[PDB]
Motif scaffolding. Structure first.
Motif, PDB file in Angstrom:
ATOM      1  N   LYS B  39       0.824  -1.200   0.000  1.00  0.00           N
ATOM      2  CA  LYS B  39       0.000   0.000   0.000  1.00  0.00           C
ATOM      3  C   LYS B  39       0.866   1.261   0.000  1.00  0.00           C
ATOM      4  O   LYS B  39       1.129   1.843   1.056  1.00  0.00           O
ATOM      5  CB  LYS B  39      -0.936   0.020   1.216  1.00  0.00           C
ATOM      6  N   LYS B  40       1.295   1.683  -1.188  1.00  0.00           N
ATOM      7  CA  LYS B  40       2.131   2.865  -1.308  1.00  0.00           C
ATOM      8  C   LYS B  40       1.400   4.070  -0.767  1.00  0.00           C
ATOM      9  O   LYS B  40       0.176   4.066  -0.638  1.00  0.00           O
ATOM     10  CB  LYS B  40       2.512   3.124  -2.761  1.00  0.00           C
ATOM     11  N   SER B  41       2.170   5.102  -0.453  1.00  0.00           N
ATOM     12  CA  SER B  41       1.634   6.337   0.088  1.00  0.00           C
ATOM     13  C   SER B  41       2.720   7.376  -0.070  1.00  0.00           C
ATOM     14  O   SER B  41       3.707   7.362   0.656  1.00  0.00           O
ATOM     15  CB  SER B  41       1.285   6.157   1.567  1.00  0.00           C
ATOM     16  N   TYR B  42       2.533   8.271  -1.032  1.00  0.00           N
ATOM     17  CA  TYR B  42       3.510   9.314  -1.316  1.00  0.00           C
ATOM     18  C   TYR B  42       3.285  10.590  -0.513  1.00  0.00           C
ATOM     19  O   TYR B  42       2.308  10.712   0.232  1.00  0.00           O
ATOM     20  CB  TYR B  42       3.491   9.646  -2.808  1.00  0.00           C
ATOM     21  N   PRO B  43       4.220  11.549  -0.628  1.00  0.00           N
ATOM     22  CA  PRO B  43       4.122  12.825   0.082  1.00  0.00           C
ATOM     23  C   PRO B  43       3.031  13.696  -0.535  1.00  0.00           C
ATOM     24  O   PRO B  43       3.173  14.174  -1.669  1.00  0.00           O
ATOM     25  CB  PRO B  43       5.509  13.441  -0.115  1.00  0.00           C
ATOM     26  N   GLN B  44       1.941  13.892   0.199  1.00  0.00           N
ATOM     27  CA  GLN B  44       0.868  14.728  -0.316  1.00  0.00           C
ATOM     28  C   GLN B  44       0.463  15.871   0.614  1.00  0.00           C
ATOM     29  O   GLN B  44       0.548  15.762   1.844  1.00  0.00           O
ATOM     30  CB  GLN B  44      -0.345  13.869  -0.682  1.00  0.00           C
ATOM     31  N   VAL B  45       0.060  16.982  -0.003  1.00  0.00           N
ATOM     32  CA  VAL B  45      -0.386  18.169   0.720  1.00  0.00           C
ATOM     33  C   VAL B  45      -1.751  18.617   0.203  1.00  0.00           C
ATOM     34  O   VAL B  45      -2.162  18.246  -0.897  1.00  0.00           O
ATOM     35  CB  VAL B  45       0.611  19.349   0.564  1.00  0.00           C
ATOM     36  N   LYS B  46      -2.461  19.402   1.008  1.00  0.00           N
ATOM     37  CA  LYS B  46      -3.769  19.908   0.598  1.00  0.00           C
ATOM     38  C   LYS B  46      -3.901  21.389   0.871  1.00  0.00           C
ATOM     39  O   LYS B  46      -3.544  21.864   1.946  1.00  0.00           O
ATOM     40  CB  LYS B  46      -4.908  19.198   1.333  1.00  0.00           C
ATOM     41  N   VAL B  86       3.421  20.593  -9.625  1.00  0.00           N
ATOM     42  CA  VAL B  86       2.171  19.917  -9.910  1.00  0.00           C
ATOM     43  C   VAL B  86       1.096  20.967  -9.769  1.00  0.00           C
ATOM     44  O   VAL B  86       1.254  21.930  -9.011  1.00  0.00           O
ATOM     45  CB  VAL B  86       1.838  18.810  -8.885  1.00  0.00           C
ATOM     46  N   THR B  87       0.008  20.788 -10.505  1.00  0.00           N
ATOM     47  CA  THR B  87      -1.116  21.699 -10.416  1.00  0.00           C
ATOM     48  C   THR B  87      -2.127  20.867  -9.649  1.00  0.00           C
ATOM     49  O   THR B  87      -1.902  19.677  -9.426  1.00  0.00           O
ATOM     50  CB  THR B  87      -1.704  22.015 -11.781  1.00  0.00           C
ATOM     51  N   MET B  93      -8.744  19.616  -3.607  1.00  0.00           N
ATOM     52  CA  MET B  93      -7.587  20.393  -3.177  1.00  0.00           C
ATOM     53  C   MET B  93      -6.397  19.618  -2.620  1.00  0.00           C
ATOM     54  O   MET B  93      -5.506  20.197  -1.991  1.00  0.00           O
ATOM     55  CB  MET B  93      -8.034  21.441  -2.166  1.00  0.00           C
ATOM     56  N   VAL B  94      -6.376  18.312  -2.846  1.00  0.00           N
ATOM     57  CA  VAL B  94      -5.274  17.491  -2.369  1.00  0.00           C
ATOM     58  C   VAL B  94      -4.394  17.115  -3.534  1.00  0.00           C
ATOM     59  O   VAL B  94      -4.878  16.819  -4.625  1.00  0.00           O
ATOM     60  CB  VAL B  94      -5.764  16.190  -1.729  1.00  0.00           C
ATOM     61  N   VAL B  95      -3.092  17.126  -3.308  1.00  0.00           N
ATOM     62  CA  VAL B  95      -2.162  16.752  -4.358  1.00  0.00           C
ATOM     63  C   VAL B  95      -1.022  15.926  -3.772  1.00  0.00           C
ATOM     64  O   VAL B  95      -0.569  16.182  -2.665  1.00  0.00           O
ATOM     65  CB  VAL B  95      -1.611  18.001  -5.073  1.00  0.00           C
ATOM     66  N   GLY B  96      -0.581  14.917  -4.511  1.00  0.00           N
ATOM     67  CA  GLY B  96       0.497  14.080  -4.032  1.00  0.00           C
ATOM     68  C   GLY B  96       1.689  14.157  -4.947  1.00  0.00           C
ATOM     69  O   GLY B  96       1.578  14.645  -6.067  1.00  0.00           O
TER      70      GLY B  96
END
Lengths: 279, 313
Positions: B39-46, B86-87, B93-96
């Motif tokens: 279960k990957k999980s990358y660095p994401q911000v919102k 990244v846009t 509003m969440v982006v990884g």
DNA sequence: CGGGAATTCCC
DNA sequence: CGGGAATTCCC
């Protein structure tokens, strides 16, 4: 009919010498002799034969390849009376033992560095056997070079004579792992039964997991313990299961020294005392 | 209380290789503290308190008290010049940040990279006194992108590109997320206050890699200590490593002992031959259920605990 | 698309 | 020097 010539009365320690990079200059560890052994350190020497009548000879130690194509080798012998891969020493018999080259040292180049150097070498007129001009670089071993001695003298009239070139026993680099002398630092335990299947840890020096084996010795006996490459931890600690001894039930234990042995060239460590026991 | 950025899942922190230039960036993707087995999980911000379209960029900033540009560089798809753009924000509003790579300039080619980074920044906004020298700021974006500028200043950054290379630690870095909202003309110029991620330590740094007690000799020793045991392990620095045995006695305290060994008893950074310490109670007969773990005196990072047994005389 | 190990440079 | 950190190369 006798003709003057030189001979290697002592080859250079075939293994154990570490090569240095330009960026390290010199070191306190120079090339040794085949004999040697920490108690009687010897140096690689030569000698001139049937040279009386030669007021003075001149020898020139200079590394060259190793196999058939004996082109000038990239690296260079550094040390006394040298300058470029070529330690020179004028000689007058009335002695003639040819010292033995004392501080002599090898200064390796860089896998990229090659072409240039080797080329800047012939450009400089250094080539004991003459290579050629079309492409002087293919597969070169930066871990095994070989000293080539030469001698020459004049006679009555300047015209100098060149007494046939003499190669040396192959010298290997102590860092080229696959080409270094194997050794066993520590070792789990030295007791253990005689049956086998006894897990024994073994902290050794640099060695490749796909070409290393440990064999227990005895009376012309040679039993090698089993272990998979997954047991060799970062080339510094081989872990293995103890093998069985030549079918014995005897109650009186015996010395079955073990040692590392390379499957590539058979070379091997200095045995390490370990004795079995009864059932 | 208004529009603001926010990190959802921080980067892993430990266990990722800053592949060198000569290695070729195509080597992996920086994960987030979670990215598990299957279960990957990358660095994401919102972006919060704003739901229109946006632009969220990321770059590498140094670690520590000061916050400047790092000589290393991020690499990936939407990346370029060590800064991924990244846009994200039409409705979600969440982006990884998937397949993020961390360059690793040679300790030699640092300065040039910095000086070039700083200067190029001495022409725009957020990058002025915050970055290069806190004595400028006169830049903070003008109106068109002023040219290379004059000397003195052109020498002030150089002087800073120096004081900084000297104190840059290439074994650690922090990601800096900076969202830009659209200010009329649809364009993105409303730059929200940035946010720095946690430290990210290069797993190739002997001083900060994961600790692992890969199979050791004896899983138990006499309570009389002095038990010499062979331990195989992942890279360690003889001078800063330790073997902490320990027990959590029932709400009465926490026992701990350390093995013995000279920085010589550590073999080529992967093996350590030590002598076990005296347990908490020696006259006892019942076997002891203890834990052993390698530990770094420097960062206090600690490997997985391996069960150990103390048996009496 | 990771990790081991060989090559160099440094202390 | 010999051990390790820095940078590569190789599978």
């Amino acid at each position: 009919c006798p003709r003057p010539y030189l001979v290697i009365t002592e080859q250079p320690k075939q293994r154990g010498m570490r090569f240095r990079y330009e960026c390290e200059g010199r070191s306190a560890g120079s090339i040794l002799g085949e004999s040697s052994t920490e108690a009687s350190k010897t140096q690689p020497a030569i000698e001139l034969r049937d040279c009386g009548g030669l007021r003075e000879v001149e020898v020139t130690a200079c590394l060259v390849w190793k196999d058939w194509p004996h082109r000038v080798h990239p690296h260079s012998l550094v040390g006394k009376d040298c300058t470029d891969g070529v330690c020179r020493v004028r000689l007058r018999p009335h002695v003639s033992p040819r010292h033995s080259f004392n501080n002599l040292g090898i200064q390796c180049v860089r896998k990229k560095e090659i072409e240039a150097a080797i080329e800047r070498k012939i450009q400089l007129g250094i080539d004991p056997y003459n290579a050629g001009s079309l492409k002087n670089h293919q597969e070169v071993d930066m871990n095994v070079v070989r000293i080539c001695f030469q001698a020459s003298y004049r006679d009555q009239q300047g015209h100098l004579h060149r007494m046939d070139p003499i190669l040396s026993e192959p010298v290997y680099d102590k860092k080229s792992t696959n080409t270094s002398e194997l050794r066993i630092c520590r070792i789990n335990k030295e007791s253990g039964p005689c049956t086998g299947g006894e897990e024994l840890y073994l902290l050794c020096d640099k060695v490749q997991k796909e070409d290393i084996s440990v064999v227990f010795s005895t009376a012309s006996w040679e039993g090698r313990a089993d272990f998979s490459q997954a047991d060799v931890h970062r080339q510094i600690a081989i872990v293995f299961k103890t093998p069985p001894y030549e079918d014995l039930e005897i109650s009186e234990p015996v010395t079955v020294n073990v040692f590392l042995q390379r499957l590539t060239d058979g070379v091997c460590s200095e045995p390490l005392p370990f004795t079995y026991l009864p059932r | 209380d208004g529009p603001y950025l926010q990190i959802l899942e921080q980067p892993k922190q430990r266990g990722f290789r800053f592949r060198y230039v000569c290695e070729g960036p195509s080597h992996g993707g920086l994960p987030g503290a979670s990215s598990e087995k299957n279960k990957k999980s990358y660095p994401q911000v919102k972006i919060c308190n704003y739901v229109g379209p946006a632009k969220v960029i990321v770059q590498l900033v140094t670690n520590g008290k000061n916050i400047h540009l790092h000589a290393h560089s991020l690499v990936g798809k939407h990346c370029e010049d060590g800064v991924c753009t990244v846009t994200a924000g039409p409705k979600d509003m969440v982006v990884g940040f998937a397949n993020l790579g961390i360059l690793h300039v040679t300790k030699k080619k640092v300065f040039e990279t910095l000086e070039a980074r700083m200067t190029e920044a001495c022409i725009r906004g957020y990058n002025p006194g915050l970055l290069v020298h806190s004595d400028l700021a006169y830049l903070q974006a003008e109106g068109g992108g002023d040219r290379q500028l004059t000397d003195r200043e052109k020498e002030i950054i150089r002087q800073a590109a120096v004081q900084q290379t000297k104190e840059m630690d290439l074994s650690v870095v922090r990601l800096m997320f900076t969202a830009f909202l659209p200010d009329s003309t649809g364009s993105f110029t409303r730059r929200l206050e940035p946010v720095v991620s946690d430290a990210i330590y290069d797993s190739k740094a002997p001083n900060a890699s994961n600790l692992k007690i890969v199979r050791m000799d004896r899983t138990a020793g006499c309570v009389t200590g002095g038990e010499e045991i062979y331990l195989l392990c992942d890279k360690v620095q003889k001078d800063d490593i330790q073997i902490r045995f320990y027990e959590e006695e029932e709400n009465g305290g926490v026992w701990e002992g350390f093995g013995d060994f000279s920085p010589t008893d550590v073999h080529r950074q992967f093996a350590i031959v030590f002598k076990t310490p005296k347990y908490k109670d020696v006259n006892i007969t019942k076997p002891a259920s203890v834990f052993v773990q390698l530990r770094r005196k420097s960062d206090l990072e600690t490997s997985e605990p391996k069960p150990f047994l103390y048996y009496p005389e």
